[PDB]
Symmetry: C3
Subunit: 231 residues, 3 copies
């Protein structure tokens, strides 16, 4: 395992998702309110899933070699198995918060599926120049999702309770900044232009992942907005 | 890319899904009605997904070689990744139209999953005779879906509004004819008996796909049945 | 096909799922009640899916070789493709019975996904000792699901009708005993410690699968609890 210089960030990533998982699980034990049970379920599953994928990467199962640029390139495919399942869960947390209509939910999830799916094709593509075509398409899907999180949700939030409006605003600004970092890291790291080496690329995705998952989860689950208005 | 004679139909297929996607996306911009937002979301995702899969085929990512009949046979596995996601979306458009009960929706989606899943196993199977066993099972699943679209939906449609009844009738006759063509093409093309060569097989699936996706979408989204009855 | 000594149990498994499928399908023909249509759809899909996976195993498609312990080990990966789809359907049958809240449903399905997903990673893992780490994690997910089926459902059941309470009790005791057998068989069979040979391991999973699927289905679908209270 220690054979790879990026092992330390995978181990740390694995540790933080595990602790994040346990904390949310224990904290959600004293919850009976049907609405809150939804947010806790969605938000505990996120780092539990990430935990398993970080572990598969640490143990070397979630890693394949991809030939391009005349080199065998280490590609951690498990990142995309992670994101495939956890990014729609995160979107669902946001969408439920503002009581999004079903059409908008299906559009967000579908676009998110396209974003992660094309990114994975981009990561596994053997023809160097074509990798960035898939990058561009995935990034376009991402921009659609961010548009809707701004110009279809923000103006839905303030028609709702103030505590769901203020919490959503914060989670929306946290999401847009963090999510936008992901295609930049990809483009400059070993999957893309290869300016930043794999061990720093792994560190960067690890910081973003823990922030996006456990950090987001902590902001959300300490808000009273997850509870129905009850006396 | 031009190495394969079927490249022209993949390129054309890619182009038409892209334009179909853009047209539906722009057209759905001026939509606020919660019901219509569902149909637009479902119906824009269909060619967006197909667009990505046609592109993966064009660039050669969605293609593998399968040994049978003592030959290496080009199999476009991405067709099934496409259909896996877009055929239930199409079914969902129909089911929502007639306000299908949940049990019937789950049965349609499940059978559709079986139909595409067994077809993919059929396409990748190394023992020639066994390929047609999977064909038969997939075709049986298909026949179940068509039965329900006739003797569980048509008699649901006319208890509803006339504009949802007339639109559903048309989309049901369009679906049954187009869908039934798919197992015939498979059986006679390179995946099956191999009487029709791959480049014509690709053309035929391309015509059916654009018709089934963009054509169906156009009939649906110009109907007033997607809107709730509003003053 | 007869090349493998376990072929007889795959053939028998295939046969029983097929007959189970046909029986449920015919029996659900005379059903109009919207609630009952849900249970019949969920419960017919279960052995139909298993039927296809048992057949893929019988024909040899659902089998790969995995190197560990310095040996090429036959691993039937199709078991997990089966379980991936059928175990949440079974959970859904239970959850609908007691009218589980949505949060609890998402938590059960998510944990079940983790349980099957980590089990599959465990089955395909090349480093012998690591296989049991994935076993432990999958088994922990399983224990979470059983906890909820006891201390979040049983006390939901008796607030409901007596016929849904008594049926759920039986299906809950049947599920907990049968499901718990699965990680034991894995640990002692060829995927784990390898004390029991593959042909007996296949027999054991076959008995459990038919019991868990067709047996469970028969108990459920002969109960009046699947029907709404109607005059
Ligand atoms: C009911 O609604 C609230 C429950 O949500 C909470 C439901 C949780 C989402 C349950 C999912 C957790 C499962 C128990 C997963 C099992 C392994 C976990 C990944 C734990 C691993 C972390 C530890 C090993 C460090
Ligand atoms: C509503 C939303 C969900 C919409 C979803 C958006 C989605 C359509 C966007 C594209 C998704 C699509 C790219 C998924 C492709 C998965 C693929 C990378 C799996 C690996 O297979 C690729 C090659 C090796 O490079 O296999 C070598 C050749 C092998 C013979 C491969 C044959 C098996 C095929 C992979 C079967 C395809 C099954 C489905 C793609 C399963 C989906 C998995 C997940 C990654 C989406
Ligand atoms: C909200 O409800 C209505 C929105 O539905 C409409 C939602 C749409 C389904 C959004 C999905 C489209 C994504 C933007 C996909 C990004 C790339 C597309 C495939 C565009 C490619 C075609 C072009 C490049 C030729
Ligand atoms: C409710 C509805 C959804 C019901 C669904 C109906 C469904 C059950 C019907 C059958 C689906 C099943 C055939 C899916 C099989 C996918 C398989 C083709 C992927 C490619 O793997 C096959 C071989 C190469 O030929 O892999 C070589 C060996 C490798 C070691 C493969 C090991 C990985 C396994 C593929 C893991 C299986 C995961 C799931 C099948 C993911 C589903 C993908 C999608 C295609 C259904
Ligand atoms: C509507 O609600 C009730 C219908 O549920 C019942 C819906 C059923 C789930 C439909 C699914 C069955 C499909 C017809 C699958 C086709 C092949 C089957 C696996 C049949 C194989 C068994 C036989 C070949 C021995
Ligand atoms: C809400 C719930 C659903 C939560 C779900 C819980 C889930 C996160 C738990 C873990 C699931 C995860 C392990 C699934 C991994 C599937 C994997 C075994 C497929 C086979 O690929 C593994 C290796 C060969 O050993 O491929 C050789 C290398 C190849 C290049 C592989 C590259 C393709 C990748 C497999 C793409 C991943 C796509 C998704 C994992 C599709 C999910 C399939 C299904 C098995 C979950
Ligand atoms: C918990 C994980 C999160 C929140 C990950 C988010 C990841 C993205 C938004 C990734 C986007 C990508 C593109 C937009 C194109 C390049 C490839 C990706 C997948 C990195
Ligand atoms: C947009 C794509 C559509 C509508 C595709 C529909 C495809 C089918 C109905 C395919 C059916 C098949 C069989 C019934 C058996 C042979 C294999 C298939 C997958 C071609
Ligand atoms: C119809 C099939 C059923 C009900 C299968 C249930 C299977 C399980 C509960 C399997 C559990 C496993 C573990 C808990 C760890 C070892 C690997 C598994 C997947 C066998
Ligand atoms: C959104 C963050 C993208 C930029 C991240 C900056 C990382 C810089 C690390 C130094 C680069 C290492 C180059 C020499 C190895
Ligand atoms: C539903 C359509 C199935 C039949 C399609 C007919 C295609 C005929 C093309 C001519 C066959 C080419 C044979 C010589 C190459
Ligand atoms: C839950 C059941 C686990 C135990 C199953 C017992 C099977 C015993 C079969 C005899 C073992 C064969 C050893 C010599 C081949
Ligand atoms: C390809 C995986 C997509 C499913 C991810 C799991 C989360 C699903 C969220 C569903 C939202 C509900 C839509 C009505
Ligand atoms: C195997 C992929 C199946 C999911 C396809 C995506 C469409 C899902 C439609 C869900 C219909 C809602 C059922 C209640
Ligand atoms: C990874 C596959 C998960 C989906 C399995 C199909 C069954 C889904 C059950 C959905 C329950 C409804 C939740 C609200
Ligand atoms: C276009 C919608 C406005 C809100 C989204 C901001 C987009 C920021 C660009 C992200 C960087 C991607 C490389
Ligand atoms: C059996 C249901 C009647 C409506 C479906 C028509 C079936 C047409 C056969 C399709 C051809 C498949 C090869
Ligand atoms: C901890 C919840 C109590 C109900 C579940 C019983 C667990 C039985 C152990 C199963 C054996 C797994 C190896
Ligand atoms: C080898 C690098 C070639 C440049 C490819 C750029 C593709 C960018 C697509 C943006 C639409
Ligand atoms: C090599 C061709 C052998 C014929 C196989 C026919 C199988 C058809 C199954 C229909 C039930
Ligand atoms: C497996 C193919 C069956 C097609 C005929 C339909 C049987 C009647 C089903 C009514 C729900
Ligand atoms: C080669 C066998 C080594 C023993 C591995 C045991 C792992 C068990 C993990 C339970 C937490
Ligand atoms: C509770 C902490 C769980 C962390 C397990 C993985 C850490 C990596 C150890 C090398
Ligand atoms: C807007 C048109 C998009 C079409 C892109 C793919 C066409 C293939 C070009 C070779
Ligand atoms: C109706 C019985 C279906 C059983 C088909 C598979 C049995 C295996 C035969 C070798
Ligand atoms: C994206 C940064 C999140 C910060 C998490 C802080 C958790 C304590 C409230
Ligand atoms: C299956 C044929 C569909 C025809 C599409 C016509 C679009 C214009 C209304
Ligand atoms: C787990 C044992 C189930 C027994 C099935 C009996 C079916 C007849 C009621
Ligand atoms: C990681 C264990 C959490 C301990 C309880 C935290 C306060 C609910
Ligand atoms: C007013 C909300 C501030 C959120 C900024 C978060 C930056 C990561
Ligand atoms: C709305 C602020 C976006 C910041 C993007 C930062 C990406 C590194
Ligand atoms: C492909 C662009 C569509 C232009 C607008 C069509 C009329 C809404
Ligand atoms: C009355 C509807 C006619 C539909 C026929 C469509 C043939 C593709
Ligand atoms: C109901 C008409 C079916 C036509 C099938 C045509 C397949 C080529
Ligand atoms: C396997 C065929 C079932 C015959 C009818 C059983 C009684 C509904
Ligand atoms: C009172 C219910 C008894 C169920 C026991 C089933 C054992 C498989
Ligand atoms: C609650 C009884 C559990 C029995 C487990 C049996 C596993 C072989």
């Amino acid at each position: 395992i220690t054979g790879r210089p990026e092992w330390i960030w995978l181990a740390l990533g694995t540790a933080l998702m595990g602790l994040g998982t346990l904390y949310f699980l224990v904290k959600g034990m004293g919850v009976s309110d049907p609405d809150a049970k939804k947010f806790y379920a969605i938000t505990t599953l996120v780092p539990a899933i990430a935990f398993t994928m970080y572990l598969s990467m640490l143990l070397g199962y979630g890693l394949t070699m991809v030939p391009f640029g005349g080199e065998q390139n280490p590609i951690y495919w498990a990142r995309y198995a992670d994101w495939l399942f956890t990014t729609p869960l995160l979107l669902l947390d946001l969408a439920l918060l503002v009581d999004a209509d079903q059409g908008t939910i299906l559009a967000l999830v579908g676009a998110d599926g396209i974003m992660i799916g094309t990114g994975l094709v981009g990561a596994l593509t053997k023809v160097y120049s074509y990798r960035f075509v898939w990058w561009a398409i995935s990034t376009a899907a991402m921009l659609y999702i961010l548009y809707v999180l701004f110009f279809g949700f923000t103006s839905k939030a303030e028609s709702m309770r103030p505590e769901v409006a203020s919490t959503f605003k914060v989670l929306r600004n946290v999401t847009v900044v963090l999510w936008s970092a992901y295609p930049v890291v990809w483009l400059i790291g070993s999957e893309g232009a290869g300016i930043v080496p794999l061990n720093i690329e792994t560190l960067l995705f690890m910081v973003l992942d823990v922030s996006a998952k456990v950090g987001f989860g902590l902001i959300l689950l300490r808000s009273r907005a997850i509870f129905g208005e009850a006396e």
